[PDB]
Nucleic acid binder design. Sequence first.
DNA 1: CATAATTTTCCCATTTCCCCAACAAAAAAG
DNA 2: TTTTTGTTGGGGAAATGGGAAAATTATGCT
Lengths: 280, 280
Amino acid sequence: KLGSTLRKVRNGKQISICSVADEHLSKSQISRFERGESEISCIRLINILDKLHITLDEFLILHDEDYTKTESFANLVQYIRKQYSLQNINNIQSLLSDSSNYTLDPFEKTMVKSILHTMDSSIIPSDDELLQLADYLFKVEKWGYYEIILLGNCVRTIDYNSVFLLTKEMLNNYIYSSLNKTNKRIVTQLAINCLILSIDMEEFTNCFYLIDEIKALLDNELNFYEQTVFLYATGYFEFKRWQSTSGIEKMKQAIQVLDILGEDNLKLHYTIHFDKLINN
Amino acid sequence: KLGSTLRKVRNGKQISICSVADEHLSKSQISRFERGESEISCIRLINILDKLHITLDEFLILHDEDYTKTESFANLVQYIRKQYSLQNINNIQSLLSDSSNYTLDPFEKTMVKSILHTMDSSIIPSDDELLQLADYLFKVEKWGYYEIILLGNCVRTIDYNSVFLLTKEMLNNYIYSSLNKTNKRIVTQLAINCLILSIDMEEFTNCFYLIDEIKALLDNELNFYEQTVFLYATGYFEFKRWQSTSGIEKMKQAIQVLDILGEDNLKLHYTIHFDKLINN
DNA sequence: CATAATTTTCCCATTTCCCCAACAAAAAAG
DNA sequence: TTTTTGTTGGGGAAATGGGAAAATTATGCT
Protein backbone atom coordinates (compact mmCIF):
# COMPACT_ATOMS: atom_id res chain seq x y z
CA LYS A 1 0.00 0.00 0.00
CA LEU A 2 3.06 2.23 0.43
CA GLY A 3 4.23 2.12 -3.21
CA SER A 4 1.48 4.43 -4.50
CA THR A 5 2.81 7.39 -2.54
CA LEU A 6 6.33 6.40 -3.59
CA ARG A 7 5.08 6.95 -7.15
CA LYS A 8 3.55 10.27 -6.09
CA VAL A 9 6.83 11.42 -4.49
CA ARG A 10 8.92 10.22 -7.44
CA ASN A 11 6.80 11.98 -10.06
CA GLY A 12 6.65 15.14 -7.96
CA LYS A 13 10.45 15.22 -7.95
CA GLN A 14 10.30 14.53 -11.73
CA ILE A 15 12.55 11.48 -11.41
CA SER A 16 12.10 8.37 -13.53
CA ILE A 17 11.90 4.73 -12.49
CA CYS A 18 15.07 4.17 -14.54
CA SER A 19 16.86 6.66 -12.26
CA VAL A 20 15.87 5.22 -8.86
CA ALA A 21 16.63 1.72 -10.13
CA ASP A 22 20.05 0.34 -9.21
CA GLU A 23 21.91 -2.92 -8.62
CA HIS A 24 19.62 -3.45 -5.60
CA LEU A 25 16.25 -3.31 -7.39
CA SER A 26 15.05 -3.97 -10.93
CA LYS A 27 12.87 -1.44 -12.75
CA SER A 28 10.04 -3.97 -13.12
CA GLN A 29 9.83 -4.39 -9.34
CA ILE A 30 9.56 -0.62 -8.86
CA SER A 31 6.81 -0.48 -11.50
CA ARG A 32 4.95 -3.27 -9.70
CA PHE A 33 5.51 -1.83 -6.20
CA GLU A 34 4.38 1.67 -7.19
CA ARG A 35 1.26 0.19 -8.82
CA GLY A 36 0.27 -1.64 -5.60
CA GLU A 37 0.99 -4.92 -7.40
CA SER A 38 3.96 -6.20 -5.36
CA GLU A 39 5.74 -5.20 -2.15
CA ILE A 40 9.46 -4.45 -1.63
CA SER A 41 11.49 -4.91 1.55
CA CYS A 42 12.13 -1.93 3.81
CA ILE A 43 15.88 -1.88 3.13
CA ARG A 44 15.43 -1.29 -0.60
CA LEU A 45 12.62 1.20 0.06
CA ILE A 46 15.01 3.23 2.23
CA ASN A 47 17.60 3.02 -0.54
CA ILE A 48 15.13 4.38 -3.12
CA LEU A 49 13.99 7.10 -0.72
CA ASP A 50 17.60 8.18 -0.14
CA LYS A 51 18.01 8.46 -3.91
CA LEU A 52 15.07 10.89 -3.93
CA HIS A 53 16.36 12.86 -0.87
CA ILE A 54 13.47 12.18 1.50
CA THR A 55 13.50 10.68 4.98
CA LEU A 56 11.51 7.58 5.89
CA ASP A 57 9.85 9.80 8.48
CA GLU A 58 9.04 12.38 5.79
CA PHE A 59 7.83 9.66 3.39
CA LEU A 60 5.62 7.88 5.92
CA ILE A 61 4.23 11.28 6.93
CA LEU A 62 3.31 12.08 3.31
CA HIS A 63 1.87 8.59 2.99
CA ASP A 64 -0.27 9.03 6.11
CA GLU A 65 -1.38 12.44 4.85
CA ASP A 66 -3.24 10.36 2.29
CA TYR A 67 -5.00 7.13 3.38
CA THR A 68 -5.45 7.20 7.19
CA LYS A 69 -3.53 7.46 10.46
CA THR A 70 -5.03 4.53 12.36
CA GLU A 71 -4.81 3.90 16.13
CA SER A 72 -1.12 4.52 16.84
CA PHE A 73 -0.58 6.13 20.32
CA ALA A 74 0.96 9.03 18.45
CA ASN A 75 -2.53 9.88 17.26
CA LEU A 76 -3.80 9.09 20.76
CA VAL A 77 -1.56 11.70 22.41
CA GLN A 78 -2.37 14.03 19.49
CA TYR A 79 -6.10 13.61 20.23
CA ILE A 80 -5.62 14.10 23.97
CA ARG A 81 -3.59 17.25 23.21
CA LYS A 82 -6.46 18.65 21.16
CA GLN A 83 -9.08 17.77 23.78
CA TYR A 84 -7.06 18.89 26.83
CA SER A 85 -6.18 22.15 25.06
CA LEU A 86 -9.90 22.70 24.53
CA GLN A 87 -10.55 21.36 28.07
CA ASN A 88 -13.06 18.69 26.96
CA ILE A 89 -13.13 16.36 29.96
CA ASN A 90 -16.10 14.27 28.77
CA ASN A 91 -14.26 13.82 25.46
CA ILE A 92 -11.23 12.23 27.16
CA GLN A 93 -13.19 10.29 29.78
CA SER A 94 -14.94 8.60 26.85
CA LEU A 95 -11.66 6.92 25.85
CA LEU A 96 -12.14 4.64 28.88
CA SER A 97 -15.68 3.54 27.99
CA ASP A 98 -16.65 0.36 26.17
CA SER A 99 -18.03 2.25 23.13
CA SER A 100 -14.63 3.91 22.52
CA ASN A 101 -13.13 3.69 19.03
CA TYR A 102 -9.68 4.54 20.36
CA THR A 103 -8.59 1.46 22.29
CA LEU A 104 -6.50 1.78 25.46
CA ASP A 105 -4.12 -0.86 26.83
CA PRO A 106 -3.78 -1.16 30.66
CA PHE A 107 -0.89 1.32 30.84
CA GLU A 108 -2.73 3.57 28.38
CA LYS A 109 -5.77 3.47 30.68
CA THR A 110 -3.54 4.37 33.63
CA MET A 111 -2.06 7.32 31.73
CA VAL A 112 -5.48 8.60 30.63
CA LYS A 113 -6.90 8.23 34.14
CA SER A 114 -3.91 10.18 35.49
CA ILE A 115 -4.38 12.94 32.91
CA LEU A 116 -8.06 13.10 33.88
CA HIS A 117 -6.99 13.40 37.53
CA THR A 118 -5.86 16.98 36.81
CA MET A 119 -9.20 17.81 35.16
CA ASP A 120 -11.18 16.18 37.97
CA SER A 121 -9.74 15.04 41.29
CA SER A 122 -12.49 12.40 41.57
CA ILE A 123 -10.98 10.45 38.65
CA ILE A 124 -8.26 8.51 40.49
CA PRO A 125 -6.09 5.69 39.11
CA SER A 126 -6.19 2.58 41.29
CA ASP A 127 -3.24 1.81 43.56
CA ASP A 128 -2.92 -1.51 41.72
CA GLU A 129 -2.92 -0.23 38.14
CA LEU A 130 -0.43 2.44 39.19
CA LEU A 131 1.85 -0.14 40.78
CA GLN A 132 1.52 -2.22 37.61
CA LEU A 133 2.56 0.69 35.40
CA ALA A 134 5.48 1.24 37.78
CA ASP A 135 6.25 -2.48 37.47
CA TYR A 136 6.43 -2.09 33.69
CA LEU A 137 8.54 1.08 33.67
CA PHE A 138 11.00 -0.31 36.24
CA LYS A 139 11.66 -3.22 33.86
CA VAL A 140 12.40 -1.23 30.68
CA GLU A 141 15.53 -1.54 28.57
CA LYS A 142 15.56 1.48 26.23
CA TRP A 143 12.94 4.22 26.70
CA GLY A 144 10.93 5.20 23.64
CA TYR A 145 8.22 7.80 23.08
CA TYR A 146 5.72 5.34 24.59
CA GLU A 147 7.41 4.87 27.97
CA ILE A 148 8.39 8.56 28.15
CA ILE A 149 4.77 9.71 27.75
CA LEU A 150 3.57 7.02 30.16
CA LEU A 151 5.87 8.29 32.91
CA GLY A 152 5.43 11.99 31.98
CA ASN A 153 1.70 12.11 32.69
CA CYS A 154 1.86 10.03 35.89
CA VAL A 155 4.69 11.99 37.48
CA ARG A 156 2.22 13.12 40.15
CA THR A 157 0.20 9.89 40.38
CA ILE A 158 2.77 7.13 41.04
CA ASP A 159 4.78 7.00 44.28
CA TYR A 160 7.35 9.81 44.41
CA ASN A 161 10.36 7.57 45.06
CA SER A 162 9.34 5.37 42.13
CA VAL A 163 8.87 8.48 39.95
CA PHE A 164 12.35 9.87 40.67
CA LEU A 165 13.99 6.45 40.24
CA LEU A 166 12.25 5.98 36.89
CA THR A 167 13.26 9.51 35.88
CA LYS A 168 16.91 8.74 36.64
CA GLU A 169 16.68 5.56 34.55
CA MET A 170 14.95 7.44 31.72
CA LEU A 171 17.65 10.12 31.54
CA ASN A 172 20.31 7.44 30.92
CA ASN A 173 18.31 5.03 28.77
CA TYR A 174 16.00 6.91 26.39
CA ILE A 175 16.36 6.76 22.61
CA TYR A 176 17.88 9.93 21.16
CA SER A 177 18.95 11.13 17.72
CA SER A 178 20.49 14.52 16.99
CA LEU A 179 18.30 14.96 13.91
CA ASN A 180 15.11 14.69 16.05
CA LYS A 181 15.36 15.94 19.65
CA THR A 182 11.61 15.62 20.24
CA ASN A 183 12.24 12.79 22.70
CA LYS A 184 15.02 14.88 24.25
CA ARG A 185 12.81 17.95 24.66
CA ILE A 186 10.04 15.88 26.26
CA VAL A 187 12.61 14.27 28.56
CA THR A 188 13.87 17.72 29.58
CA GLN A 189 10.31 18.83 30.35
CA LEU A 190 9.73 15.67 32.40
CA ALA A 191 13.00 16.19 34.30
CA ILE A 192 12.01 19.79 35.08
CA ASN A 193 8.59 18.69 36.32
CA CYS A 194 10.29 16.06 38.47
CA LEU A 195 12.57 18.83 39.75
CA ILE A 196 9.56 20.94 40.75
CA LEU A 197 8.06 17.90 42.47
CA SER A 198 11.43 17.24 44.14
CA ILE A 199 11.48 20.74 45.60
CA ASP A 200 7.90 20.05 46.69
CA MET A 201 9.09 16.97 48.59
CA GLU A 202 12.25 18.80 49.80
CA GLU A 203 14.62 16.08 48.54
CA PHE A 204 17.46 18.44 47.67
CA THR A 205 19.87 15.65 46.75
CA ASN A 206 17.45 14.63 44.00
CA CYS A 207 17.11 18.34 43.24
CA PHE A 208 20.88 18.80 42.76
CA TYR A 209 21.11 15.66 40.63
CA LEU A 210 18.23 16.69 38.36
CA ILE A 211 19.57 20.25 38.12
CA ASP A 212 22.87 18.93 36.78
CA GLU A 213 21.06 16.51 34.43
CA ILE A 214 18.71 19.20 33.08
CA LYS A 215 21.70 21.51 32.67
CA ALA A 216 23.32 18.85 30.49
CA LEU A 217 20.14 18.31 28.45
CA LEU A 218 19.71 22.07 27.91
CA ASP A 219 23.34 22.70 26.94
CA ASN A 220 23.54 24.20 23.43
CA GLU A 221 19.87 23.33 22.96
CA LEU A 222 17.85 26.42 22.08
CA ASN A 223 14.88 25.26 24.20
CA PHE A 224 14.46 28.64 25.87
CA TYR A 225 11.05 27.57 27.20
CA GLU A 226 12.68 24.73 29.12
CA GLN A 227 15.46 27.14 30.12
CA THR A 228 12.87 29.59 31.49
CA VAL A 229 10.92 27.03 33.49
CA PHE A 230 14.27 25.65 34.68
CA LEU A 231 15.33 29.11 35.83
CA TYR A 232 12.10 29.30 37.81
CA ALA A 233 12.80 25.75 39.04
CA THR A 234 16.24 26.76 40.33
CA GLY A 235 14.59 29.72 42.00
CA TYR A 236 12.00 27.52 43.72
CA PHE A 237 14.85 25.19 44.72
CA GLU A 238 16.93 27.97 46.28
CA PHE A 239 13.82 29.46 47.97
CA LYS A 240 12.71 26.20 49.62
CA ARG A 241 16.29 25.47 50.70
CA TRP A 242 17.67 28.74 52.15
CA GLN A 243 15.19 31.45 51.02
CA SER A 244 18.01 32.79 48.84
CA THR A 245 17.79 36.28 47.38
CA SER A 246 19.29 34.78 44.23
CA GLY A 247 16.52 32.19 44.13
CA ILE A 248 13.72 34.74 44.36
CA GLU A 249 15.69 36.79 41.83
CA LYS A 250 15.64 33.83 39.41
CA MET A 251 11.93 33.21 40.03
CA LYS A 252 11.20 36.87 39.29
CA GLN A 253 13.38 36.73 36.16
CA ALA A 254 11.43 33.75 34.79
CA ILE A 255 8.08 35.53 35.07
CA GLN A 256 9.86 38.47 33.42
CA VAL A 257 10.68 36.25 30.43
CA LEU A 258 7.08 35.05 30.34
CA ASP A 259 6.09 38.73 30.26
CA ILE A 260 8.39 39.81 27.42
CA LEU A 261 7.33 36.75 25.40
CA GLY A 262 3.61 37.57 25.87
CA GLU A 263 2.84 34.05 27.13
CA ASP A 264 -0.07 35.33 29.31
CA ASN A 265 -1.18 31.93 30.64
CA LEU A 266 2.28 30.67 31.64
CA LYS A 267 3.06 34.00 33.29
CA LEU A 268 -0.27 33.75 35.13
CA HIS A 269 0.17 30.24 36.54
CA TYR A 270 3.79 30.90 37.53
CA THR A 271 2.62 34.16 39.12
CA ILE A 272 -0.09 32.44 41.18
CA HIS A 273 2.52 29.91 42.38
CA PHE A 274 4.96 32.68 43.34
CA ASP A 275 2.04 34.36 45.14
CA LYS A 276 1.49 31.35 47.39
CA LEU A 277 5.23 31.21 48.04
CA ILE A 278 5.39 34.88 49.07
CA ASN A 279 2.03 34.91 50.89
CA ASN A 280 2.98 31.99 53.14
CA LYS B 1 20.71 -6.54 8.41
CA LEU B 2 17.85 -4.86 10.27
CA GLY B 3 16.38 -7.94 11.97
CA SER B 4 19.32 -8.34 14.34
CA THR B 5 18.54 -5.14 16.22
CA LEU B 6 14.87 -6.09 16.10
CA ARG B 7 15.92 -9.18 18.04
CA LYS B 8 17.73 -6.91 20.49
CA VAL B 9 14.67 -4.68 20.77
CA ARG B 10 12.42 -7.71 21.18
CA ASN B 11 14.72 -9.17 23.81
CA GLY B 12 14.87 -5.83 25.61
CA LYS B 13 11.09 -5.71 25.96
CA GLN B 14 11.25 -9.43 26.93
CA ILE B 15 8.44 -10.47 24.60
CA SER B 16 8.52 -13.66 22.54
CA ILE B 17 8.43 -14.23 18.79
CA CYS B 18 5.02 -15.89 19.25
CA SER B 19 3.77 -12.57 20.64
CA VAL B 20 4.75 -10.43 17.64
CA ALA B 21 3.62 -13.20 15.29
CA ASP B 22 0.20 -12.54 13.82
CA GLU B 23 -2.05 -12.94 10.79
CA HIS B 24 0.43 -10.79 8.82
CA LEU B 25 3.69 -12.67 9.54
CA SER B 26 4.58 -16.24 10.54
CA LYS B 27 6.84 -17.04 13.52
CA SER B 28 9.42 -18.81 11.35
CA GLN B 29 9.82 -15.69 9.21
CA ILE B 30 10.52 -13.60 12.31
CA SER B 31 13.12 -16.13 13.46
CA ARG B 32 14.82 -16.02 10.06
CA PHE B 33 14.63 -12.23 9.68
CA GLU B 34 16.08 -11.68 13.16
CA ARG B 35 18.80 -14.19 12.26
CA GLY B 36 19.74 -12.13 9.17
CA GLU B 37 18.57 -15.00 6.97
CA SER B 38 15.51 -13.55 5.19
CA GLU B 39 13.97 -10.10 4.71
CA ILE B 40 10.39 -8.95 5.32
CA SER B 41 8.60 -6.09 3.60
CA CYS B 42 8.57 -2.72 5.36
CA ILE B 43 4.84 -3.03 6.07
CA ARG B 44 5.35 -6.19 8.14
CA LEU B 45 8.35 -4.69 9.95
CA ILE B 46 6.21 -1.65 10.81
CA ASN B 47 3.54 -4.01 12.15
CA ILE B 48 6.05 -5.87 14.34
CA LEU B 49 7.43 -2.57 15.64
CA ASP B 50 3.90 -1.35 16.40
CA LYS B 51 3.35 -4.43 18.54
CA LEU B 52 6.60 -3.62 20.41
CA HIS B 53 5.71 0.10 20.97
CA ILE B 54 8.56 1.65 18.98
CA THR B 55 8.67 4.14 16.11
CA LEU B 56 10.40 3.27 12.85
CA ASP B 57 12.67 6.24 13.51
CA GLU B 58 13.20 5.02 17.07
CA PHE B 59 14.06 1.58 15.69
CA LEU B 60 16.37 2.87 12.95
CA ILE B 61 18.09 5.07 15.55
CA LEU B 62 18.72 2.04 17.75
CA HIS B 63 19.94 0.21 14.62
CA ASP B 64 22.33 3.08 13.83
CA GLU B 65 23.57 3.08 17.43
CA ASP B 66 25.23 -0.16 16.39
CA TYR B 67 26.72 -0.89 12.94
CA THR B 68 27.42 2.33 10.96
CA LYS B 69 25.46 5.06 9.17
CA THR B 70 25.90 5.33 5.42
CA GLU B 71 26.93 9.01 5.36
CA SER B 72 23.96 10.96 4.02
CA PHE B 73 22.90 14.60 3.76
CA ALA B 74 21.52 14.27 7.28
CA ASN B 75 24.86 13.14 8.65
CA LEU B 76 26.56 15.74 6.46
CA VAL B 77 24.69 18.64 8.08
CA GLN B 78 25.33 16.92 11.42
CA TYR B 79 29.08 17.09 10.76
CA ILE B 80 29.06 20.64 9.35
CA ARG B 81 27.05 21.94 12.30
CA LYS B 82 29.52 20.36 14.72
CA GLN B 83 32.52 21.79 12.84
CA TYR B 84 31.04 25.28 12.43
CA SER B 85 30.33 25.43 16.17
CA LEU B 86 34.02 24.67 16.82
CA GLN B 87 35.19 27.03 14.01
CA ASN B 88 37.07 24.46 11.91
CA ILE B 89 37.10 26.22 8.54
CA ASN B 90 39.56 23.78 7.00
CA ASN B 91 37.50 20.83 8.23
CA ILE B 92 34.46 22.11 6.36
CA GLN B 93 36.37 23.19 3.25
CA SER B 94 37.94 19.73 3.04
CA LEU B 95 34.50 18.38 2.05
CA LEU B 96 35.03 19.92 -1.41
CA SER B 97 38.45 18.34 -2.06
CA ASP B 98 39.27 15.03 -3.71
CA SER B 99 40.21 13.52 -0.33
CA SER B 100 36.70 14.03 1.09
CA ASN B 101 34.99 10.82 2.17
CA TYR B 102 31.67 12.62 1.83
CA THR B 103 30.86 12.97 -1.88
CA LEU B 104 28.82 16.15 -2.10
CA ASP B 105 26.27 16.58 -4.81
CA PRO B 106 26.23 19.92 -6.70
CA PHE B 107 23.65 21.55 -4.46
CA GLU B 108 25.43 20.13 -1.40
CA LYS B 109 28.61 21.80 -2.66
CA THR B 110 26.71 25.07 -3.12
CA MET B 111 25.41 24.85 0.45
CA VAL B 112 28.88 24.10 1.85
CA LYS B 113 30.41 26.96 -0.14
CA SER B 114 27.74 29.24 1.30
CA ILE B 115 28.50 28.03 4.82
CA LEU B 116 32.17 28.81 4.15
CA HIS B 117 31.12 32.27 2.90
CA THR B 118 30.15 33.29 6.44
CA MET B 119 33.52 32.04 7.74
CA ASP B 120 35.46 33.64 4.85
CA SER B 121 34.19 36.33 2.48
CA SER B 122 36.59 35.20 -0.27
CA ILE B 123 34.79 31.85 -0.68
CA ILE B 124 31.83 32.71 -2.92
CA PRO B 125 29.67 30.25 -4.88
CA SER B 126 29.79 30.92 -8.61
CA ASP B 127 26.99 32.89 -10.26
CA ASP B 128 26.09 29.71 -12.16
CA GLU B 129 25.85 27.22 -9.28
CA LEU B 130 23.74 29.56 -7.13
CA LEU B 131 21.27 29.94 -9.99
CA GLN B 132 21.41 26.15 -10.40
CA LEU B 133 20.34 25.58 -6.80
CA ALA B 134 17.70 28.31 -7.17
CA ASP B 135 16.39 26.60 -10.33
CA TYR B 136 16.16 23.33 -8.40
CA LEU B 137 14.28 24.86 -5.47
CA PHE B 138 11.88 26.73 -7.77
CA LYS B 139 10.65 23.42 -9.25
CA VAL B 140 10.14 21.55 -5.97
CA GLU B 141 6.84 19.92 -5.03
CA LYS B 142 6.96 19.20 -1.29
CA TRP B 143 9.83 20.62 0.79
CA GLY B 144 11.71 18.05 2.85
CA TYR B 145 14.67 18.37 5.20
CA TYR B 146 17.01 18.35 2.19
CA GLU B 147 15.44 21.31 0.38
CA ILE B 148 14.80 23.23 3.61
CA ILE B 149 18.43 22.98 4.75
CA LEU B 150 19.67 23.84 1.26
CA LEU B 151 17.65 27.08 1.23
CA GLY B 152 18.29 27.96 4.90
CA ASN B 153 22.06 27.85 4.40
CA CYS B 154 21.90 29.91 1.18
CA VAL B 155 19.46 32.68 2.24
CA ARG B 156 22.15 35.35 1.83
CA THR B 157 23.82 34.05 -1.36
CA ILE B 158 20.99 33.76 -3.90
CA ASP B 159 19.00 36.72 -5.25
CA TYR B 160 16.89 38.36 -2.54
CA ASN B 161 13.57 38.23 -4.39
CA SER B 162 14.33 34.63 -5.40
CA VAL B 163 15.06 33.80 -1.75
CA PHE B 164 11.81 35.39 -0.54
CA LEU B 165 9.80 33.61 -3.25
CA LEU B 166 11.37 30.28 -2.27
CA THR B 167 10.57 31.04 1.39
CA LYS B 168 6.93 31.79 0.57
CA GLU B 169 6.71 28.55 -1.44
CA MET B 170 8.43 26.55 1.33
CA LEU B 171 6.05 27.75 4.06
CA ASN B 172 3.11 26.30 2.08
CA ASN B 173 4.73 23.04 0.91
CA TYR B 174 6.91 21.52 3.66
CA ILE B 175 6.33 18.16 5.35
CA TYR B 176 5.18 18.46 8.96
CA SER B 177 3.78 16.16 11.66
CA SER B 178 3.87 15.82 15.46
CA LEU B 179 6.33 13.03 16.32
CA ASN B 180 8.84 15.36 14.64
CA LYS B 181 8.34 19.11 15.00
CA THR B 182 11.97 19.56 13.86
CA ASN B 183 11.26 20.65 10.29
CA LYS B 184 8.69 23.15 11.54
CA ARG B 185 11.25 24.68 13.93
CA ILE B 186 13.83 24.93 11.15
CA VAL B 187 11.24 26.50 8.84
CA THR B 188 10.33 29.04 11.52
CA GLN B 189 14.00 29.95 11.98
CA LEU B 190 14.41 30.31 8.20
CA ALA B 191 11.34 32.55 7.98
CA ILE B 192 12.66 34.78 10.77
CA ASN B 193 16.05 35.10 9.06
CA CYS B 194 14.25 35.95 5.81
CA LEU B 195 12.38 38.61 7.83
CA ILE B 196 15.68 40.11 9.02
CA LEU B 197 16.98 40.12 5.44
CA SER B 198 13.68 41.67 4.30
CA ILE B 199 14.15 44.57 6.71
CA ASP B 200 17.73 44.79 5.45
CA MET B 201 16.51 45.25 1.88
CA GLU B 202 13.56 47.38 3.10
CA GLU B 203 10.73 45.37 1.45
CA PHE B 204 8.25 46.02 4.25
CA THR B 205 5.32 44.28 2.51
CA ASN B 206 7.37 41.08 2.47
CA CYS B 207 8.04 41.85 6.14
CA PHE B 208 4.30 42.14 6.87
CA TYR B 209 3.65 38.81 5.11
CA LEU B 210 6.43 37.00 6.97
CA ILE B 211 5.32 38.48 10.30
CA ASP B 212 1.85 36.98 9.89
CA GLU B 213 3.28 33.65 8.66
CA ILE B 214 5.80 33.36 11.52
CA LYS B 215 3.02 34.31 13.94
CA ALA B 216 1.07 31.32 12.62
CA LEU B 217 4.06 28.97 12.92
CA LEU B 218 4.82 30.09 16.49
CA ASP B 219 1.25 29.80 17.86
CA ASN B 220 1.27 27.51 20.92
CA GLU B 221 4.71 26.23 19.91
CA LEU B 222 6.98 26.70 22.92
CA ASN B 223 9.91 27.87 20.77
CA PHE B 224 10.84 30.79 23.02
CA TYR B 225 14.13 31.20 21.12
CA GLU B 226 12.28 31.67 17.84
CA GLN B 227 9.81 33.95 19.65
CA THR B 228 12.70 36.03 21.01
CA VAL B 229 14.44 36.43 17.66
CA PHE B 230 11.03 37.21 16.14
CA LEU B 231 10.38 39.89 18.77
CA TYR B 232 13.74 41.45 17.89
CA ALA B 233 12.81 41.03 14.21
CA THR B 234 9.56 42.96 14.65
CA GLY B 235 11.54 45.59 16.57
CA TYR B 236 13.98 45.95 13.67
CA PHE B 237 10.95 46.07 11.36
CA GLU B 238 9.21 48.88 13.26
CA PHE B 239 12.51 50.78 13.72
CA LYS B 240 13.57 50.75 10.05
CA ARG B 241 9.98 51.44 8.92
CA TRP B 242 8.74 54.15 11.27
CA GLN B 243 11.62 54.66 13.72
CA SER B 244 8.96 53.49 16.15
CA THR B 245 9.44 53.99 19.86
CA SER B 246 7.74 50.60 20.32
CA GLY B 247 10.28 48.91 18.04
CA ILE B 248 13.33 49.96 20.05
CA GLU B 249 11.45 48.73 23.12
CA LYS B 250 10.90 45.35 21.43
CA MET B 251 14.58 45.09 20.52
CA LYS B 252 15.54 45.95 24.10
CA GLN B 253 13.10 43.33 25.39
CA ALA B 254 14.69 40.67 23.17
CA ILE B 255 18.22 41.51 24.32
CA GLN B 256 16.77 41.43 27.84
CA VAL B 257 15.59 37.85 27.27
CA LEU B 258 19.00 36.82 25.92
CA ASP B 259 20.56 38.21 29.10
CA ILE B 260 17.93 37.02 31.61
CA LEU B 261 18.47 33.44 30.44
CA GLY B 262 22.23 33.76 30.03
CA GLU B 263 22.91 32.93 26.37
CA ASP B 264 25.90 35.35 26.44
CA ASN B 265 26.97 35.06 22.79
CA LEU B 266 23.44 35.48 21.40
CA LYS B 267 23.16 38.53 23.66
CA LEU B 268 26.45 39.73 22.16
CA HIS B 269 25.40 39.34 18.52
CA TYR B 270 22.03 41.02 19.07
CA THR B 271 23.72 43.71 21.17
CA ILE B 272 26.27 44.53 18.47
CA HIS B 273 23.39 44.77 15.98
CA PHE B 274 21.33 47.13 18.17
CA ASP B 275 24.47 49.16 18.91
CA LYS B 276 25.24 49.71 15.23
CA LEU B 277 21.59 50.60 14.55
CA ILE B 278 21.43 53.17 17.36
CA ASN B 279 24.89 54.53 16.49
CA ASN B 280 23.85 55.18 12.89
C1' DC C 1 1.54 16.11 -38.93
C1' DA C 2 4.50 12.57 -38.44
C1' DT C 3 8.14 10.48 -36.80
C1' DA C 4 11.51 9.53 -32.95
C1' DA C 5 12.82 9.84 -28.36
C1' DT C 6 12.11 8.06 -23.35
C1' DT C 7 9.28 6.28 -19.75
C1' DT C 8 6.70 2.61 -18.71
C1' DT C 9 4.80 -1.91 -18.40
C1' DC C 10 3.84 -6.69 -19.52
C1' DC C 11 5.17 -11.61 -19.38
C1' DC C 12 8.05 -15.58 -17.61
C1' DA C 13 13.23 -17.78 -15.73
C1' DT C 14 14.61 -18.55 -10.73
C1' DT C 15 15.34 -16.92 -6.56
C1' DT C 16 13.58 -15.99 -2.38
C1' DC C 17 10.17 -15.80 1.09
C1' DC C 18 6.32 -17.58 3.86
C1' DC C 19 2.33 -20.22 6.10
C1' DC C 20 1.65 -24.83 7.97
C1' DA C 21 2.98 -28.09 10.30
C1' DA C 22 6.25 -31.10 13.27
C1' DC C 23 9.90 -30.80 16.47
C1' DA C 24 13.23 -28.88 20.09
C1' DA C 25 13.74 -26.82 24.46
C1' DA C 26 13.85 -24.26 28.37
C1' DA C 27 11.16 -23.10 32.01
C1' DA C 28 7.91 -22.06 36.23
C1' DA C 29 3.06 -24.51 36.04
C1' DG C 30 1.66 -28.38 38.67
C1' DT D 1 3.82 -33.42 32.10
C1' DT D 2 1.77 -28.21 31.71
C1' DT D 3 1.54 -24.03 28.78
C1' DT D 4 5.14 -21.90 26.54
C1' DT D 5 9.36 -20.44 22.63
C1' DG D 6 13.23 -20.89 19.14
C1' DT D 7 14.58 -23.15 15.22
C1' DT D 8 13.82 -26.35 10.94
C1' DG D 9 11.94 -28.44 6.31
C1' DG D 10 8.18 -28.82 1.92
C1' DG D 11 4.25 -27.46 -1.14
C1' DG D 12 2.90 -23.04 -2.52
C1' DA D 13 3.14 -18.30 -3.53
C1' DA D 14 5.00 -14.24 -4.05
C1' DA D 15 8.82 -11.35 -5.56
C1' DT D 16 12.71 -10.32 -8.68
C1' DG D 17 15.65 -9.64 -13.20
C1' DG D 18 15.85 -9.61 -18.02
C1' DG D 19 14.05 -8.90 -22.35
C1' DA D 20 10.21 -6.83 -25.91
C1' DA D 21 5.14 -3.83 -26.84
C1' DA D 22 2.52 0.42 -25.80
C1' DA D 23 1.52 4.68 -23.73
C1' DT D 24 3.39 9.30 -23.45
C1' DT D 25 6.24 13.05 -24.57
C1' DA D 26 9.79 15.50 -27.44
C1' DT D 27 10.82 17.15 -31.70
C1' DG D 28 12.09 15.86 -38.01
C1' DC D 29 12.59 19.25 -41.22
C1' DT D 30 10.30 22.05 -46.38
